[PDB]
């Protein structure tokens, strides 16, 4: 029955649970964390506890904080450090993420992902768009030939961009981290008056390392069409396969 956790192990397990609730990881390693919490923190670690910690870190933030995501009330050596760093290294051991605390721009960017639109059925659009040309409204593409690097700026986070045989690093205004799992890119979600997801993320790819030679992004592109009266909710949806391979000409 011995499930004693060391401080680093317990912290990694807490971070794994945080990542799981952020929907960045599908798994967690947390066995023995209830007693670890009740012993090294003094409070219960139920779901509500985690929700409130993530809330008060990313929203309703209060000045200084510690590595366990605890703040010092409002006004101003274990957890009693409360050293507001520029970042927090949420590392569970299985997946790392550099999460940023609240400011004046992260509070402006918090949207409430609580519903979802109906997009458009499927406009007769092409599936073999390249990188240079896009013309999408949800997608912006930057190519730094000086670094052999590609930034894929997305403007519509609800529209997914599944990766395949790819190794990317997405930088958000809430948390920067790298993704290698093929499929939908996973973004953090705080439940605070609803589920809150970041307003935009950026997908950087290093074309140097041949790691993303076979990298294919299947995504959805948005372009206005014809209007029966006004372009009132003019149609704008068609699937597309974007290739990153270093194919000349």
């Amino acid at each position: 029955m011995e499930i004693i956790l060391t401080l680093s192990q317990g912290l990694k397990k807490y971070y794994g649970k945080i990542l799981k609730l952020l929907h960045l990881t599908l798994e967690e390693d947390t066995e023995g964390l209830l007693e670890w919490c009740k012993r090294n923190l003094g409070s219960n670690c139920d779901d509500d506890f985690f929700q409130k910690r993530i809330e008060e870190f990313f929203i309703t933030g209060e000045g200084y904080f510690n590595e366990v995501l605890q703040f010092k009330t409002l006004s101003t050596e274990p957890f009693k450090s409360y050293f507001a760093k520029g970042f927090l290294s949420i590392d569970s051991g299985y997946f790392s993420a550099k999460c940023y605390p609240r400011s004046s721009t992260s509070g402006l960017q918090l949207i409430n992902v609580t519903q979802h639109p109906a997009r458009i059925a499927e406009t007769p659009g092409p599936k073999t768009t390249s990188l240079k040309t896009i013309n999408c409204i949800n997608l912006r593409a930057s190519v730094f030939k000086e670094h052999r690097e590609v930034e894929i700026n997305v403007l519509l986070p609800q529209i997914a961009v599944n990766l395949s045989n790819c190794h990317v690093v997405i930088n958000s205004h809430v948390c920067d981290y790298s993704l290698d799992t093929d499929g939908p890119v996973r973004l953090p979600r705080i439940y605070h008056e609803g589920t809150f997801m970041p307003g935009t993320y950026k997908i950087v790819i290093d074309r140097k390392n041949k790691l993303n030679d076979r990298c294919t992004l299947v995504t959805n592109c948005v372009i206005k069409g014809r209007e029966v009266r006004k372009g009132q909710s003019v149609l704008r949806q068609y699937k597309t396969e974007i290739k990153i391979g270093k194919a000349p000409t």
Partner: antibody
Amino acid sequence: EVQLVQSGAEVKKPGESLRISCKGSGYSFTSYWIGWVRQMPLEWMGIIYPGDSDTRYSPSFQQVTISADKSISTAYLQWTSLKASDTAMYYCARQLYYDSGSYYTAAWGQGTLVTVSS
Amino acid sequence: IQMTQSPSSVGDRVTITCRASQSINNYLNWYLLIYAASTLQSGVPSRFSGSGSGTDFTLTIDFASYYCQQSYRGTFQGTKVEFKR
């Protein structure tokens, strides 16, 4: 140097409320954890942080209440209803990487005798 | 959750051992006398020495009462060491 002075011995009746204290000097009363330990005529009772704090009562041992006022650097241990089983000596102790080398250090007061009798 | 429930003269330099119900690394602070299961506190004579591991520890040597403590939940048994004639 560092000194811990406890409140005097208390003789109360069963059902009477009681509050004993422990005042610290020679140190900030904000960084080194401070706890209470029972010895019936040693049983660990509780601990709290000396500054802004919650409380770490021993499992199952928690009906008493441990608190503290950092404005006067004084910790408190109180009973709402004393029982004859609470007649014992109660020691307050200041104590300084994981569990070892940490707050359960026992880095002590003179002891407070509490006698519950009608 | 159980804890340390299994433990253990005419001027005879002796030794007191101790066990536990689970592994507890190397704390068992003995009383202040010895912490870190071996380290001596500033102001304690060097004749007191500590050793052992989580399953069982030893303290090798003023005849009085003594015993140890865990640094996790539960903490502290009592042995009385004075007897002659």
